[PDB]
Amino acid sequence: GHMNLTPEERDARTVFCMQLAARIRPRDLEEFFSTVGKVRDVRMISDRNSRRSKGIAYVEFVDVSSVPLAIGLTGQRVLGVPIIVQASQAEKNR
Incomplete structure (x- = not known):
């Protein structure tokens, strides 16, 4: 259980997306989440x-x-x- 949030907890909201196609766009992932979510930024390995x-x-x-x-x-x-x-x-955990 939490009690309060940390600044460094915001850093950890990133979602690793593996098993992707060779020819995916950066957007293909941000779209896929935006249907239920909001994206901060897109750090696709080029x-x-x-x-x-x-x-x-x-x-x-x-x-x-x-x-x-x-x-x-x-x-x-x-x-x-x-x-x-x-x-x-x-x-890491506390």
Whole structure:
């Protein structure tokens, strides 16, 4: 349980989006959440190198409660682009 929020908790609202298509746009992820949510910014790895994973992005949400929202979206697949439940959490707790 929380008691109060932290400034650094806002940093952690980001959602790691893995399993993505080689040819996804940055917007394809922000759209996919905007239907139920609000986006702060879009930190898509510029996946053009043609030799790495080719299926990753990090979307900054504006809201803590959209992290467990985004988890619940794992089994959709826009054009063939599902998302992992992973979140962009950290190996830290107080």
